[PDB]
Amino acid sequence: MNIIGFSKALFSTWIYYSPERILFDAGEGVSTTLGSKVYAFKYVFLTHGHVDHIAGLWGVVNIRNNGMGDREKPLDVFYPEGNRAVEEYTEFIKRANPDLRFSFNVHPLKEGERVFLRNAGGFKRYVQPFRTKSEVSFGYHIFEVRRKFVTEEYHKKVLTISGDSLALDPEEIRGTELLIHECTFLDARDNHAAIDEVMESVKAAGVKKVILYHISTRYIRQLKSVIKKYREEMPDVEILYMDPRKVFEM
């Protein structure tokens, strides 16, 4: 029970990573799908300000302010610096519902800027935004600071979410313990990435587990086939995907 999410091209995208109690993006539906689980979120990291990536936030905050009782800690929301939609939306919520003014706080983030989560199991955990490949979009890394000569520290990439983007350069992805990569087009684009393009970076980076999301509803029937295909062309890499028609769970 590590990840539960939903992704549909232009309708809604939200991915809940529970180990660190983080919600990445918040398309409409999230609060309705997870009911009381929304009480467990400690952070929401927005990849972009489009509708289908933040409209579900209002429901998350409302449900939490209703059922967490007097014992409710504010929800921290991060989004890329300079996103007018997030600012206005967040301002609208408080304005519209004054009883929500304290239910959450928002925080602008700049590229490469770390955010310290907590210290557990002997390690410090951080989330860090990297710009995706106009409109500032962010992808995110969740890493642990570890020590492999005082000793030598290093970042252990526990998770990497791409957000809307093209196949990320293997360098940004090398070392991920779990890659959640967008995979809109199964071939010819209109910018979003094509699967051929994503799997290539995967190989170059030697990543062994990948979750493909934000799939076009059309590629459906063809999808279930392309994966079985790829899964066999890279027999050491675990490839999973979020079907545009169902809540994804792992």
Place this chain on the structure above:
Amino acid sequence: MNIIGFSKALFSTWIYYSPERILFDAGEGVSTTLGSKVYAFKYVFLTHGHVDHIAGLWGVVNIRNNGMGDREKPLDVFYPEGNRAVEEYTEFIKRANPDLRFSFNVHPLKEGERVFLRNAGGFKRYVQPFRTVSFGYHIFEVRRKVTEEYHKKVLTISGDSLALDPEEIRGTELLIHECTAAIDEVMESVKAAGVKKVILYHISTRYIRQLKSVIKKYREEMPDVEILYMDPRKVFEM
């Protein structure tokens, strides 16, 4: 003739009445669930202004403007005059995304104010609201019978409110009542009004493994009345 909806107390509630291309209330997920069907919407009537009744509007209006052409027809949105949330949300939508500025229009309604739908089959239909600042709605068609014109209640929808006075529901071909208003409160009014078919909604997830039998026991005390309910755990179709 055809209905697809979803209702879960506090989370989301939206009901699409296909016959007259009307969406009643717009909680989150509506556009995700209906996909392209949202292009067919002609009207949206809001019963109230809480989050779970309107937060899905933004998706509805964004999906349409993206998939509907130039001459695109603006979606008309009516709400109970006086609900700051709806105007503020609407304004937020248009400001944050100007491309949607003319994609739809919002109109406040006072209790009793009629809204004209269209004219087909030799009849006109209208939607008219009634208090319960929440609103419920009636979809009536004007027919002449003597030559005395009369209003036929094709549909009645309550919205967050208690059982309705059987006179307000008198002679409706279909009653959609919120059932969190106690069932008896509603059913008694039903048996009183003479209504033959009713769908309950806005039910708690808490009384699912208990409500079942209730409707079963009721469909027996009123073997002539059809009692349908919306399972807050899944989409409802009819």
